[PDB]
Structures are given as structure tokens and as C-alpha cells.
DNA sequence: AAAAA
RNA sequence: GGACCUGGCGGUGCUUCAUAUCCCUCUAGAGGAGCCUGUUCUGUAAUCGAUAAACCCCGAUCAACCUCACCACCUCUUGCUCAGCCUAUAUACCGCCAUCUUCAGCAAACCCUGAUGAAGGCUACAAAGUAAGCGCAAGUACCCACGUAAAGACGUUAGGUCAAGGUGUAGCCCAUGAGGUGGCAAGAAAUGGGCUACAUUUUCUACCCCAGAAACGAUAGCCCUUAUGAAACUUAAGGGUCGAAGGUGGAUUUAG
């Protein structure tokens, strides 16, 4: 059971992004290059176009895992930074203190 | 993935286990509200009946 | 998102609020307020809408040298329980709405003419049994503080007696 | 296996009989909750992958096949379920993981269930006779399972030994009156299973002797050459035979010693070493050895026992509740008729917090033997287990504890003595009385203590029974010391108006202790 | 219900072994351990918080498992299984001239059930290079084909092999690089003459 | 047991960083968090392959729930097969 | 109230019977030191408070000194001053006019017949289970001030001694730096200095010329500015010794500033080696031998510079 | 670490060396030194095995097989 | 006004207890931590997993035993060997306890791979400091 | 605005 | 109608101070100008809240096509995990915070005086005050005992937020709900903050000041190219002719 709709959309784009992304790679490398033939280059343009969106990593969007908040999440704990400061001042997380200086 | 955990806590509150208050609450205010005159809509109930 | 889930009484406090605004300073009728209810009282540990009898949980462990199985119940058993927590919960609410017999006074909400009973006995050892208590004037004062705004203080006038001349009175 | 707090420390036996089911419930029912939904235990994180992750499960994988999903219906409503299924779909029944699951678990039900396993097709006669003599085993039955086994001798073919021990299992311990034959048709089997070049294992040499011993109570002999037989055999042989030799030579030597030294050497020369695992309950042997020492008082067995399941490992000592019981209990009463006080005690504090508790007889000599020799310190423990085990046995303790104290007076160093007898009447008043309330008076007024002298006297006055003479006489004096003979006139009214044999008696110990005081 | 059971304040004699009771890492049981043990934040007038309920002793590591007599004996017991350091290897001058190549390992903890690491998966081969037939040409030709990896001061080689994810295919992979170097040795082309 | 370790007190490192104290217009009270740590390592000489398993054995089984352990042993070896005259 | 006292005393013993059983000494030999060094090393207590420390001392500790009890079963109370709130103060005030008296009586028979420091009263409350206030506490110093301007003898010397102590030391004198001779060195001493986040290490000789070496090479190629070489020099001027002392000093870490100001410390602290204490102590006084801890202060998350604020207007 | 982890028994000779991998390709032109390119990439990558490295060189020679026109036209020969 | 997670001081009827009554700015002074794991160190990762799993276990904790827990749990992240070391109370009987233990100890063993022994503590109730 | 043999 | 007590206030009197405060006073800034980012206005179909000392590179430590709560078009009435709102009340809360706070006063148990009225209980050469507890002092850490940081109660602002996160009351699920493509940061105009310089104190060259030279610098806009991005309508950077008021600010203010 889920109550939001934002984190699921974010999720499955995740999810979608991770099983379609060799091919978007080996397009990107055969993009970019020095000379190579140009038809090369359309076809891959081609082919990296005809497929559909909710699948790019463009829209991938970081949020929490408890709250779905887009800005202000620290990529160590993956969260928000109002539940994390409020159990590092419970007390329980090691190391997360008051700078006392 | 809280797919998982939300079936694990769904299960253990069905059987009697995982004794949560919220959910208590939640069904204990949907009642008082069925019972005050304020049921939940149905199917055929709104804008057409 | 599904973990959202907090503690009870964290909730209970949010919902109720005894601590409003509306109240500490007379803007608010008491009367419009929530009443509350509790609901950890009558759940034994392991029981939900399924039936499961538990070894140790329940029935007793040790039943004539034999360990008892775990079965599940069936249908009529948990009507059963189902219409035993119904006449639980109405004899609760039975009990909740029930107000004891006020007995007045002088008159009506007045507390002129009520005998609160015998005194509080002495630190000493010295306990007053044949006095008794009456309250005789009752009165909210206020006084416009600094800080708190309205300052409510009760000042009830109480008088005591025996009934062998020996008496006085105290505010 | 417990816990350490003292709210669940293992104190007595039941309490950890208790902990221990309630834990096997838990362990059974989380099983059961995690294999109830397999889609809950899907992922795996760890990437070494710890081997107790996996689920199992009940529901078979494939449908469409027939002997196979008969097989993993039943082994990998369970039997008849899959015989139906192979019945319905044609499947052919195997030798092999069906004929010897079918006359084991599923006794007319699975004999015939084996017969029609064995008729439905011509698989091994091995596997068949063997299926056969174990139906006919657990359903009182020796001739068809002795006629299955000579046709799989006489069939060209080596027979299996279970079929030889379950035949000889129905034919001794089913039976009535019967040691010589039993003997004679287990020799013939041997010398024919040689004959037709077939090896013979120990297990069924020591399910003869179990059977031979199970029976006839004068069966010596023919033991000590079984159990001699499976000893020669290879290596440690079962325990269950030795259990039962020693169990036939023990309950006909209660005069003499020989049979239980017979008994001893055949102990020890068919399984007398370390923890020998070939029989199915290794600890009787050690609760049996354990009950003659303590019915003949032995020194000799419950030493070698203590050295048999201790030294080399832990688990020929102690297998169920009342066999770690009475083990105690026969090395506590073995430690008090051998060791002095000190070394007993020491042994006491050692094995009793170690494993279980004593048994009965047994746990109350050893309190007779140590309150006979000036020994009584841990009197509240003794109560409290006398009162947890049962709500009779703890007036008795009572009883025999303030017996020992009632007579006693106050000397000049009897605080000890004292505080006893004051706990051992607590005890008796605590137990929902005559003797024990007549015995917390005398100990009462011995004391020294006058307030509760007074409250037992009053005590054991209203409850409509009146006490002995010595108490009686010890009041008495107790009145007649401070010049008051107003206690001994109302003790003298008491045992008067109560119909009891204290009246011409009481009153003259009245008139005198109002003479002379 | 309830019940009162005597804890391990009136088993405990005046000789009894530490590590016999606490074998294991135990997190320190009040309810057993008879030590008076008190800490906490005090007031003016009163005591500090015991040790029942104390959960500030609970979250210190203890260690009572740590007794010096087991520590004796455990290290009286390991004995067997400690092999001999031979006296030739006691100087770094033989030690060094004797076995001049290094092989560092990895070996990391982590907190979880799984115990993959891409970082413990990199070898550091420090030999130093002035125990071998180096030469005047061969050196410089090495010299020139290492660069900077090479230090001209204490003549250790350090090369980061990390190309696969196993320790024993990461040596053997330095061990080819080295031939392969080594062959440079003997194995010459024909752009000498341009040098 | 008779190996002679040494053991030094390198330099401590403290992790920082700043989070905002509430969640609105409130940019004038900030709540910072330190991380402090501490390093102490051990300088080991002279031990074999099987008194090097040994003790990390005897290390790991009495390890905290709170602490790091990184191992980095350096074998001996004198010269492999083929380094002097291999082929290809 | 004893019982509990009791309790604890006897859980107190069987602890340290035990500590000392599975430490594996003497309890006799047991002492409190080892008690609490057995406690640190068992109980590993990482904090920064110092009153948050897993302790096992005696009860006398724990337990603050419990007022004992005055009155018997009659009711009388055991002290004389026992009527008026404060016993024992009034009994020592008492006591003290007496002695006041008995002074003024000797003084006047005597005429016709012709280091340490006070109390606290932190530490006079602490010893006696008593509480005051101040300007009684002032009284009774001024008292005691006038008692010890009378003409005393042993007695009341004694007497007023009993409620004295003894201060600290009060010499803050550096350690003299004694002479070093490592390989043929002649006039040879080190010295060290930490200010505003620089080491440096001078090495102060008695025999070459008028030459500062910095990093083995010379201090003008260092030292551009003129700053440092008069910072440099002003310790060699206040002695009036330059063309016979050359040092060769080894910074490292800060800036021009920083670095100049270190080994000018080097410099002071290493000068006490040839010279008397007074000149020492003249150059102490003058701004030498003293540390200068004046470090940069912490930015705090809200203001510019650790003290001016950011842009607070009015409207 | 390698408990769980041998990555299926592969030598670092498959890892390193990808020199068997280069039979339906020309020895000169852009392809060449497309093919020298993905090699000298894929042998510096640690995460992935000899497995990926066969699949990507089977994906490549079917990419180009697929469009033969493309390499036909683009003043090379696919040999 | 700073309203953090300390106790609020009122009236004096709140059977506050030692844990949470201290500040929140006396965490390493005068207090401690409940978890504690190496993944609180620099050069270390796998954090919110560890977060995750800890405000499960402590929702889990919570939510079977409805009041039969004192104030909060000591976690002890050994590795590979969790320990949820708290208290007990002296209200049920010692067969239930038994049965959660065991039940909670198989849950997470053959859950989250990982073994977990307990350490009860013979508490009559909460441990109460001040009835502030 | 009273207290699961 | 008259009288008494407390608080606030008096452009109400006296007394001790303003260690960065008010001038006589020392330094640096805001309306001299440009660029960037916000409040608000206008047009359009194109979130919202705070918008008064205590809000203006504020929610947001990220808005080029999800993030996006707005609009135009097409579908689904289990309407996706048998469950919610993307709608209104912070005058229903829990939770996280703000100037006061650059200090020290407030709450349980007693007694006395106000004839026992609301209230007050301060005189150490002492006339009735004892006070558990709270916050500072006392305490922790950094460069110790200096200094700094962390903290600093009972409340006014129905203060900011149902918009960290969840809960009460209204309306709906044959929607005020959910999924797909594109657009939304465009300009008559007022306003705050950050940076830049307004020449011999500045600019450049290698050594960061024993040097030399030219009587100054950052930004519109334009062309090419580069890291990621499926495609630069902008916030990134490098190269190139042109390169916009600039030549030290007067009505009021802030910190050290
Ligand atoms: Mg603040
Ligand atoms: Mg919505
Ligand atoms: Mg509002
Ligand atoms: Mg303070
Ligand atoms: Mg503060
Ligand atoms: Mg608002």
C-alpha cells in the first residue's frame, strides 16, 4: 500500500532507467567521436529518438525514501534533513553530534 | 522496495500481530464517521444519483 | 511513504490538543471540544480477525504432559469474539456516558450546602473524625498580570464543625 | 539455552521443562508463518548467500508428471493421496522411497498399503519383504514377516537386516512367556543370514537383545551372548540392548551383587566409552544405571556412569526431563552416603544449578541425611522447591524440618537453628492443620521469641486441634516462669473444651504452676 | 505472574573465575553482574543513576570477556599453531636481498550481511629493483619506459594493478607485466641507433 | 606472546557540515554536526603467514560493533617461474 | 536510612572482593587507585563529561553527608543553639566572641601589668553540613580579621590557624634551558614555539657572526620584508648582543608573519642558557618569554567575519 | 573477498587481452580504430568480466551486420 | 523558542525518566547513542540501509510489545551479530516473554541473515529520575 | 470534564 | 455613583552605567553606475505561502521537455497496490523555529499582616520569612582559569508552516482523483541584497613587492568551440574586432 504517487513515478523511472541503459550508452559513445561516417551517427540519433521518455536518467530525480522531498537531501543517508536531524538529536545514530567546537 | 513491508505489516495487522494504534485510529474515526451520517461513497451515489 | 507511522500517544496529543489557545484564555466555549477513548485495554498479546491459539500466549503450555497444536479457528468462533468485543465496547461507552449523582446543595450548580466529608488527618498522628467540612462561598477572582493576561484564582470560604461548640471557620 | 535475568533464570525443573516448550512452540509457529507466505522471502541481499534462506516448500512444482509428483507429494492425506494420483494417472510404483515409506508412516493401513505396493508390480523382493516385516512388526505379527524374509533368502537374493530385526522384534517382545525359543529362532536367522552370504549389522542383534530382554526377567545368558555377539561385530554397539539387560539383570538381583556387576560388565563391554550414537534413546542406559545406584545405594555404578557421560562428552548423561531427574537425585544421594558435608555440599551446588532437579525418594533421604548431621542452612530453597513440585509433599518437608527443631531449645549459639525452625513453621502456615501447627508452636515457644510463642499458641488453639503433650508441658513452664498461670489455665480450658487427652494432666500442670507461682 | 529468584549476588564464592562466567562478549546484565558500578549525571542533593535500568552502561562496549587470565590462556593455548621466524630474516638487509618482492593485501569489514568490496580488490607490488641483472642499458631502457612510477631514490617499484576483480589474477597479471618488461631486456627492435 | 609491536597516535580528522535549524524563513540560526574520530594503528613486524592468521582470528573474534579493520599484509617471495628466461 | 548506607557499603566490599578476584591480586593490596583503573580499562566510558564516569568508591561519597538527627525520645535536642535555625554557626560565632573577649581581657592585663589564606564558603558548607548566606559569611571574616590583628600567642593562634589553608605555588618561571653539546657542539641549544599555527626550532649559537639561517639557506632570501628582520633582530637588541651570536633556525608552516613571530619566541626561549635569571626576567616582562595564543577566531554560521553580523537593516 | 566471488573461474588472460576478439574486422580505417578503442576500454574495466566483454563484441558485430549498407558506404570495406 | 525533543518544564506530574530528559546538545557530554555501526565513520557508505533497517527493527520492537518496553533499545551492530539488549517488565507472565524472545529471535534470523540474542533486565517499571 | 485450575 | 490592588504607559522626577555606544569620534557599507537574484505590477490559460522592527540569492544546499502543486488536447469510474485528494481552516495539533534573550525570575508544601476584601511579606548594628525544581552563573569542547562555540524556563506576536512528516471538521471516486504530448523564467514600471570597479592606493610580466612598462576593468549583445545532457530558448568555461553610464555618492543609517 502507497500513499504517494511522486515517489512511485520517481521509483519506476529508476527502475526503468536501469533495465534500458546499455543501449543508450553504446548510443552516447557512438555519438561522440572525431571523425566516423555521419550516417552512423543519424541512425544512432535515430534510434535513440524513436524510443519513448521514462527511461532517460535526465529524469531521474533524487528525493527522500520516507518523505519524497526533491531539494535538501544529503546522498549519504538518501533523506530528508528534517527526520535525520531530529533522530541524531534523540540520539541515536553514532558519530552525528552538536558541533560544540 | 516498502511494497514488501507494506504486505508484511498488512499481514500482521489482518492476523493480530503488529499491533498499530494508527491503524486502530484511523478505523475507529472511519466508523464514527459512517455512524455519524457520513458513510463512505459508493458506486451510484453522487453527481448521477 | 509507508513509514509514517509514529506513536500512539504523539498521536493522541495531535488529535485532542489540551494545550489550545482557545481555552487558556476564555475565547472558547468548553463545550466544543473532542472526548477520548481508549483503546489498549481490552487486546490480549496475539489476537486479530483470523483466530490463532497460541500455546503460551493463552490456553496454558503444560496441559496433562502434552504441548497443544496451533490451529486456526474457523468461522463461528470469530463471530463469537467478534460480538464479545461489540458488547465490550457498548459497555464501555455504557459506562462513559453514565454521570454520577451530584448532590446539591442550596441549590443547583452551587457549591454552597455540599459536605466535602472529614478533614485531612495531621502529619502528627491526629485524626479528625467527628469534625466536618462545608463550603459556604465559592468565587473565580481575576487579576490582569503581566505576563499570563487574566489570572484565574478560586477563593473558596470553608467552615468546620463537630456539633459540641467547639468550631471555626477558614478561607 | 535459557536466559540470565533472574526473572527467567532456570531455578527448578518444571520452569525449564516450561522455557523449553514454549521456546520449540515459537520456534515451530515462526516456521511456520515464514513458509506460509513464500513470496515474502524472494530476495536475497547477501551476496555469499547464507544456505538458511531458503523457504520450504509443500505444493509441487510440476503437475503433469505422475510417479514424480506422487514422490514429492509424499516424501520430497499425503500417502493415500499420492497413491491415488499414481492410480489415476497410471504410474508405475517403484522398490525404492515408496514400499518402505508406505509400511513406516502409512497398523492395517500401512501393511496393506505395502501389500498392494508390493502386488501392483514385480519390483525387488528385498525391498518387499522388508516392507511387510515392518507393517507386520508394529501390528503384532511374526509369521508372515519370518515367511517374507526366507523367500527373500531362498529368492536368490541377500536380505536386508531390518526385516530380520523386526521379525525378531514380533516374535520376542510380542509374545508371552517365551526366552529359550525367542533365542533359537534369532541363532537360526544368524546361522541362515551367514549361510546365504549376508552381512549382518548391529542393529538388529541389539533389537533381538532389546526384545529378549523386554520379555523374560531370568534371561541372562542369552544376553550376555547378544549383547557379546553385537560387540563382535565392528564397532560400539546400541545402548537400547545394553538398556534393557541391565533393566532384566537389575529387577531380579536386588539381594545379591553378582547380577548387577553382570549387568555392569555387559554395560560396559557393549557400549563403554564415550557417547556412542547407534540405538534411538542412549540416555536410558544412564537413567537406568542412575535408579540402581540409587535403589541399592551403589558405588561403584554411579561412578562409572559420572565418568561415561562427562569425561568423553556431554550426551549420554541427560536426555529427557525425568531421566536428568532422577540422575541428579542418584548423584546427590551418592555424594551424601560417600562424601563427608563438605564435598557433598559441593557437589549439591554443582549439579543441582547445573542441570535439573532431584526426584522424590531420593532428594528426601539426602535432607534427612543432611539435617541428621547438623546441617540446616538452605532450608527456604528446600521449601520452596517442595511447595513448586507439589501441594502435598511440602507439608511433609515441613513436617521433618521442624521435627528435627521443635524439641531443640535456645542455647547459647542456636540464631541458625532458630531462624530454621522460624522458617520452617512459615512454611507449614503457608501451605493453604495438627501436627504441623502443633510442631510451629513447639518451635515457637522453643525459640525464644514471646509474641509469637503467644500467636501460634492462639493459632493452633482455634483451629480445632489440640497439640502434643510436650508442647503442652513447655507452655506450661513457659507461663509458670514469669508467675502467671493465666496462659497454662487457658491452654488447660483449650485442650478440654477441644475433647482431647490433655484434662486431668493439664489441669494438675496448672494447679502446680499456680502453687508454685 | 511474579516470582523472586536469588541472581548470581549469592552463587559468586570468593575464588570463582572471571572468564568461566562471561565467556563470551556479553553487553554487561545488571541483573547478574554484582558490581556496583554508578555513572550519570548527578544532582546537588541526592545520588546518581545506578545500575538498574542504566542504559548508558548498556551502550558502553564492556569488556569483562577480556580477563587477563584468559587472555594468558588463550595465548598459552595458540602457541601450537604459531610456526618459527627464522634468525636469517631478523635484518632487512638479508630479509630485503632475500625476498625483495611485496605483495600488499586487502582486507576490509564491513557492517552487513555481505561482504563484496571493489576496493579490496587492488594489489600494491613493491619490489625494489637493485637485486636483479640490471644493467646500463636495460636500466635505461626500463627507465625510460616506466617514467614516474619509478622513484630514483630508494628504487621501489610501484605499479596499481587493479584490472579484475580477484587478488591472485591481479598478481598474476603483475607477474606478466614484469616479463613483459623484462623482455625489453633481451628482446631489442631497431630505433637504438636514433637514441 | 612474544612478538614486540609498536603503536603511535596519528592525526585525527573531524567531519562537518551545516543544516538549517528549521525549515522556513529562518536563515539566521544554523545547527551545525561534527563527526569526531580517532586512528590508532598498530606497527607489526616479524610474523608468518599462520601467526598473522591467527591473530586476526583471535582480533576478529573479540571485535567491537562500532569500529574498522583494514588488513594489508605484505608476502615474501624471492622470484617467480618465470621472470628470468620465459617465453612470451 | 543506616539500612540502605549498610546495603551499599556491603555491595561496595563484595565488588571489590570480586574486582580483585578476577584481577588476580590481593584484595588487601587492592587500592582505590587500581579499583579505578580496573574500572576504566573494563568500563570504556567515552565522554567528555567528567562526572558521567563509571565510579565504585565508598557510600561516604555517593551519598551526600546526611544531617544527623538532634532530638532523643524526650525531645530535647542534644545542642544547646538548637532553637534558632542555624546550630553550628551560632555555636563558632559564640566560640569566637569568647575568644575576642578572653583577647581583649589578656591585652588589658598584659597592659596594666607593665602562604595561607582563609576559607571558601563553597568549602566551609561542604565541611559542615551547614547553609549561609554572604553578608553573615562577611561578618564573620571580619571577625576573624580583627582576631588575627589582636595580639594572639598559641592558643587563638592555633585556633585561628584551624580555619586556614595553603595556596599554590606562585613562581611561574620558565625552566632555565641548560647547555647541550651534541658531537662538538660548543654553545649549542634548541628551543621550540607555537603561535598563530607555526613551529619553529632555532638553534641559538654563542660564537659565529651577525647571520640568521632559515631552512639552511639565509634569512634574507626568506625574510624580504624588513618586518621580520627587525622582528628578528629585536630579541638579540635587547640583550645588545648581534656580531657574536648566530642561530639557524628550521620553521615551517604559516606565513611570513606567523613564522617570523615563532622563531622570535625560539629566539627569547632559547637565550636562557648564557645569561643571568634577571635579564631573563627582564625580557619576560618586556614581551619575550610569553606565549601569544592569538589564533584566528571560528566563523559562525550567520555572521561575516566570527563578529560582524550580515546585512541587518531597520525596514 | 573472494568467498562467492571468483567470477566464474576466468583467467586474466580473457580480462586483459582481447587480441582473440578481433577476426571479422579490417586492420585499417576508422573501424579499426573504433574496435582499438573499445578494447583499450574495456580492458581497464575492473567491474565487469570476460561475459560482458563477449556480449558487447557480439552486440557490435551484429550492429554492423545489421547495417551492411552503412559500412559498404562509408568509404570502407567490412572485411 | 529552541523546542527540541527535551522535556518541557511545566508541572510536576510527568514521570519523565534518565534517557530523553537531557538536552539534545548533551549527547556526547552527558548522554549516549542508542545504534552504533561503522557506518558512521569517514570512508565508509551503506548508511541508509543501516537507517532503515534501525527504524525497522525499533517500529517492530514497538509495535509487539504494546507497552511491555521501558523506554528505548542499545543497539549493536557487531558485523555480522545484532543484539537488541533492553528490559523487560514485571507485569506477564515468564512463558509469553519466552515466546516473543524466541519468535523475535527467528524473525531475524532467518530475515535479515543475521543471528540476534537478547539480555533482559529485571525492571519493575519505567525508570523513572524525576517526577518533574 | 471506576477497574489468564 | 464613590473607594482599593496589579500590569502597561507618562514628550514623569532623581540616582549608577551605555567597552562599539550617542556625539566631539577611527575604519568599512546601503539610493553615483552595471550584472545576478527576490517583493510587486502589466499581458496571457500558466502554483502557492511569508510579504511590519521578527519576510526579500526567503520555502529551494537547483525550475531546459518528470522535479511542475498551472493551463490546452486525449483516456481510466478500482478509478493501481480495497486505497486517496495536486481543495478550505496552523481560530484543532503533534513536530521544527523566530526580535524579546546585550539580564535573571517563575512554580508544589507552611505561617504572618491586610478586623481573614481583592493582595503583600525587602531592612546582617536586620521589624516574617524557610523554599524542593526550572534557565544562566555553576557546567562541555577548542588555543587552561582569557576568549569562542553549544545552551538560556513559565509567554506576547491565534507569530512562519496542515506546503519535513502524520492526525480532527467539510465535498468527491461513474471527481476537486490518476496517466500521456506541448507551453509557462515575457516587459510599461517602483523596490532589497551579493560582486565589480569609479588611476598612480590601480593594471600587466617569471620569482609575491631592492624590478620594469603602458599617462585603468568587469557584464550587454555577436561568431566558433569544449565536460555531461536524445536536441544550449541562459545559470559553466576558452578563443576573437567592436565593448554601454564609469572619473570616489549631498535628504537617512548599520557593525567593529
Ligand atoms: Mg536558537
Ligand atoms: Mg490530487
Ligand atoms: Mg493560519
Ligand atoms: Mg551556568
Ligand atoms: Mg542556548
Ligand atoms: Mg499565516
Redesign the interface.
Known sequence: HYVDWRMWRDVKRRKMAYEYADERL?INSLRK?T???K??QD?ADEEIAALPRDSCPVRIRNRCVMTSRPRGVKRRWRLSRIVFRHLADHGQLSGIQRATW | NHHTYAELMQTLRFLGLYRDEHQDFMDEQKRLKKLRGKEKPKKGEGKRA | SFFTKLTADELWKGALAETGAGAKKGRGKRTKKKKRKDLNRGQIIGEGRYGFLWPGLNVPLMKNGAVQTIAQRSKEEQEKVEADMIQQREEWDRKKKMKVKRERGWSGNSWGGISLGPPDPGPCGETYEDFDTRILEVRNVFTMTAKEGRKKSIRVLVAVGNGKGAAGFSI | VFQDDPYLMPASSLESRSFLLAKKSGENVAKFIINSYPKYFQKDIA???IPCLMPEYFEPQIKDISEAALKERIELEPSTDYHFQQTGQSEALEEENDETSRRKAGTWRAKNNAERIFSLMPEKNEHSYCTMIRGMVKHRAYEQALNLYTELLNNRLHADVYTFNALIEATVCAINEKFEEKWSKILELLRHMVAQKVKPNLQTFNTILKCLRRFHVFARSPALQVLREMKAIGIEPSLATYHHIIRLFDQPGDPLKRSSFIIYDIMNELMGKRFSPKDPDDDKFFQSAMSICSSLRDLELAYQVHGLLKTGDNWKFIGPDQHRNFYYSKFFDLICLMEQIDVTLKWYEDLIPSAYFPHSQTMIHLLQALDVANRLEVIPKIWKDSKEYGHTFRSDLREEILMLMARDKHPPELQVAFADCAADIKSAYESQPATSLNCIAILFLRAGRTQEAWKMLGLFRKHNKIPRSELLNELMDSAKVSNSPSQAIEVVELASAFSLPICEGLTQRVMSDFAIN | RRKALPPRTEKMAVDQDWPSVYPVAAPFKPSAVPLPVRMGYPVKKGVPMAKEGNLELLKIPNFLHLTPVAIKKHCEALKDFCTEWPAALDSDEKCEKHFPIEIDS???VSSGPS????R??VVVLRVKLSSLNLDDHAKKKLIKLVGERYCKTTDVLTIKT??????R??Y??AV?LLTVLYHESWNTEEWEKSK | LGISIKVHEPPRKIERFTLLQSVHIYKKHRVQYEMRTLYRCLELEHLTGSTADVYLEYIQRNLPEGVAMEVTKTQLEQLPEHIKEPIW | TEDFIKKQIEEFNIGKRHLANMMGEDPETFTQEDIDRAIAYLFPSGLFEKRARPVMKHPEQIFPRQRAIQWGEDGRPFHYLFYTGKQSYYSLMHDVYGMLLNLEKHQSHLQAKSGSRWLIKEELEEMLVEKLSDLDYMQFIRLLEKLLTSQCGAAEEEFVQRFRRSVTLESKKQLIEPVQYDEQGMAFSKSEGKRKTAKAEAIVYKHGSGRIKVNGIDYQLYFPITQDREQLMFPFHFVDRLGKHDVTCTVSGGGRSAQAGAIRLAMAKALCSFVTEDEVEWMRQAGLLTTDPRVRERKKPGQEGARRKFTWKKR | ???????DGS??HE??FLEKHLESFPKQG?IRH?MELVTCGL?????L?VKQKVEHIE?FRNYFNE?KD?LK???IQFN | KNRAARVRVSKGDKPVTYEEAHAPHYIAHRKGWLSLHTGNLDGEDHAAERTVEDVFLRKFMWGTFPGCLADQLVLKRRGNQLEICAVVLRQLSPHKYYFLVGYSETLLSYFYKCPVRLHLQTVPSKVVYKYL
Open positions: 553504446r567521436n571523425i566516423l561516417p550516417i552512423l541512425v | 551476496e555469499p548467500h | 586487502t582486507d576490509y561482504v563484496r568490496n571493489p579490496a580488490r587493479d584490472r579484475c576483480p580477484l587478488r589474477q591481479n598474476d597479471y606478466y | 573477498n573472494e568467498a562467492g566471488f571468483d567470477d583467467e586474466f580480462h586483459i576508422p573504433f580492458s581497464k574495466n575492473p567491474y568480466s552486440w547495417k552503412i558506404e562509408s568509404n
